[PDB]
Amino acid sequence: MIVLFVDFDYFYAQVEEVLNPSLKGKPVVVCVFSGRFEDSGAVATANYEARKFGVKAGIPIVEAKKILPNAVYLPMRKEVYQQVSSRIMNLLREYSEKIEIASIDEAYLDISDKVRDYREAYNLGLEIKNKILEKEKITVTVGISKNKVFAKIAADMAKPNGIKVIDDEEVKRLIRELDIADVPGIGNITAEKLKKLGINKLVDTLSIEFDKLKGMIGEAKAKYLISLARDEYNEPIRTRVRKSIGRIVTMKRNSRNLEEIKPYLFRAIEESYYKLDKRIPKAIHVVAVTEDLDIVSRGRTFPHGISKETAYSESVKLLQKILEEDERKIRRIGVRFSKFI
DNA sequence: GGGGGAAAGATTCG
DNA sequence: TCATAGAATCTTTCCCCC
Ligand SMILES: Nc1ncnc2c1ncn2[C@H]1C[C@H](O)[C@@H](COP(=O)(O)NP(=O)(O)OP(=O)(O)O)O1
Ligand SMILES: [Mg+2]
Ligand SMILES: [Mg+2]
């Protein structure tokens, strides 16, 4: 194939800079405030100035402030970012309609029916960066290679404001040379199970017995790694359809009182139903984060769609089934709907 | 022995 | 008073027949 991957640079932070140009040059932090105390919550993203000091996505806002006290801290306005990303995705459906929209800021493009070779895709890539830089002022990074995986890897190396091709010879080079931890889908838990087997490159997966690999990282992740090591990984760019819709909130204090948790859970239901929008779920799950940050959940499928009033009652049952079967207090409560009609 | 579905959890952050 | 959020994909155990 010819796959073209685009991922927007420090996206939420950069949108705030587009909307408020006097931020360019200072470190910007976009935050998901939780409401337990002043500055509780986590960082959604920071721009590249703030990353130099270790302020990146996922870390506590308090930790970010101990490092960069006088950085600008903005609250996460996701609805604004979704609107700008939709407009950039509509720009991308003009360069192929085989398009995989994989996050709020990523898309894979099957440009096999649209250019010839890699120098023909590298130039379409600059066409897309320029068209995006002018229509919406956002810089992006482009990866191009023979499949979706090495496309993403390509952009990960080219970041920020970059565009990199990985051709077939470097794909072979990287199957030998790239640390396997840098393959998409390989987190820290997978990455150390692989080192405890002496696997550090993709090619080492061809040298180990399969069932030993399958027993340690699972059948699916083993076949995924081996097919990448054989240069056999070929997977279609396909249109993804949302299979879950939910909402989860943080309670102002840890609790296990049914009457006290209920408002939090009902607002999560009301919000999910708005987002559901004509879609009808047959399946519902209640999700709780305990005071020690474990994640517990109880669900139930139905033979028919779930009305909002049902959802309301079913969740209180599922939520009690949690306070029953578990001992710890609850920190965050949420609901998730699936199995649409 | 499967198929197929469900439930609850684990991993990744695609 | 560290530790958001939403979604996908997968593993394991269970179940219900046949
Ligand atoms: N842990 C998180 N929590 C909340 N939102 C997050 C998040 N991680 C990412 N986002 C939201 C906000 C992120 O901006 C947006 C895009 O995520 P990426 O493309 O993974 N990171 P970005 O574009 O910021 O930087 P780069 O230039 O390194 O891609 O998704
Ligand atoms: Mg990005
Ligand atoms: Mg992204």
Selection from A24, A306, A55, A234 nearest residue A139 by Cα: A24
Tokens 């890897």 correspond to A153
A156 belongs to an annotated ligand binding site: no
Considering the domain architecture, whether residues A216 and A279 belong to the same structural domain is answered as no
How many Cβ atoms are within 10 Å of A239's Cβ, its own excluded?
10
Contact A271, A212 (CB under 8 A): no
Considering the domain architecture, whether residues A101 and A113 belong to the same structural domain is answered as yes
Chain C nucleotides reached by a protein CB under 7 Å: 1-12
Q: Whose CA is nearest to atom 1 of ligand 1?
A: A58
Burial A126-139 (b: 16+ CB within 10 A, else e): eebbeebeeebebe
- Torsion of Cα atoms, A7 then A10 then A13 then A14, to 10°: -70
Long-range contacts of A219-226 (CB under 8 A, 24+ apart): A221/A185, A221/A186, A221/A190, A224/A185, A225/A180, A225/A183
Boundaries of domain holding A39: 12-78
Tokens 């056999």 correspond to A232
Tell me, in Å, how far CA of A291 is from C1' of C16? 38
Considering the domain architecture, whether residues A7 and A135 belong to the same structural domain is answered as yes
Find the residue closest to B14 using CA and C1' atoms: A184
Protein side of the strand C interface (CB < 7 A) = A 32, 34, 36-38, 40-42, 44, 57-58, 60-63, 218-221, 224, 240-250, 253, 268, 271, 275, 289, 293, 331-332, 334, 336
For residue A86, the domain's CATH number is: 3.30.70.270
Considering the domain architecture, whether residues A88 and A131 belong to the same structural domain is answered as yes
Residue A93 lies inside a defined structural domain of this protein: yes
Tokens 């070779």 correspond to A117
Sheet with A41-46, edge to edge strand ranges: A41-46, A28-33, A72-75
A277 belongs to an annotated ligand binding site: no
Residue A203: in which H helix or E strand, if any?
A: none
Considering the domain architecture, whether residues A135 and A72 belong to the same structural domain is answered as no
State the nucleotide closest to A61 in CA–C1' terms.
Answer: C2
Q: Is residue A31 helix, strand or coil?
A: strand
Which amino acid, one-letter code, is at A118?
Answer: Y
Q: Whose CA is nearest to atom 2 of ligand 1?
A: A44
Q: Which two tokens stand for residue A40?
A: 């509780």
Q: Distance (Å, rounded) from C-alpha A338 to C-alpha A283?
A: 5
> Ligand 1 mean position to A85 CA, how many Å?
13
For residue A51, the domain's CATH number is: 3.40.1170.60
Domain finish residue from A34, A57, A78: A78
* Residue A256 CA: distances (Å) to CA of A131, A277, A315, A320, A328: 52, 31, 15, 10, 8
Residue A224 lies inside a defined structural domain of this protein: yes
Considering the domain architecture, whether residues A109 and A7 belong to the same structural domain is answered as yes
Domain finish residue from A78, A95, A130: A78
Tokens 């995924």 correspond to A224
Mutate to test the pocket of ligand 1, among A105, A141, A142, A156 (most ligand atoms within 8 A of CB): A105
For residue A310, the domain's CATH number is: 3.30.1490.100
Residue A62 lies inside a defined structural domain of this protein: yes
Q: Is residue A260 helix, strand or coil?
A: helix
Strand partners, A283: A301, A338
For residue A196, the domain's CATH number is: 1.10.150.20
Residue A57 lies inside a defined structural domain of this protein: yes
Burial (CB count within 10 angstroms: exposed 0-12, middle 13-18, buried 19+), residue A21:
exposed
How many structural domains is chain A composed of? Answer: 4
Tell me, in Å, how far CA of A175 is from C1' of C13? 36
Residue A287 lies inside a defined structural domain of this protein: yes
CA A27 to chain centre: 23
Residue A130 lies inside a defined structural domain of this protein: yes
> Ligand 2 mean position to A9 CA, how many Å?
4
Domain finish residue from A144, A170, A196: A170
Active site residue A136: no
Selection from A296, A314, A297 nearest residue A305 by Cα: A314
Considering the domain architecture, whether residues A278 and A163 belong to the same structural domain is answered as no
Contact A113, A123 (CB under 8 A): no
Catalytic residue of the set A16, A100, A106, A314: A106
Beta strands (DSSP E) in A152-210 are 163-165
Considering the domain architecture, whether residues A146 and A201 belong to the same structural domain is answered as no
Considering the domain architecture, whether residues A63 and A85 belong to the same structural domain is answered as no
Tell me how many helices (H) and strands (E) chain A has: 12, 12
Considering the domain architecture, whether residues A61 and A101 belong to the same structural domain is answered as no
Considering the domain architecture, whether residues A125 and A177 belong to the same structural domain is answered as no
Considering the domain architecture, whether residues A67 and A108 belong to the same structural domain is answered as no
Find the residue closest to B9 using CA and C1' atoms: A296
Residue A236 lies inside a defined structural domain of this protein: no
Residue A235 lies inside a defined structural domain of this protein: no
> Ligand 3 mean position to A187 CA, how many Å?
16
Report, in this order, helix, strand and coil percent for chain A, each rounded to 5. Answer: 45, 25, 35
Q: Distance (Å, rounded) from C-alpha A297 to C-alpha A309?
A: 20
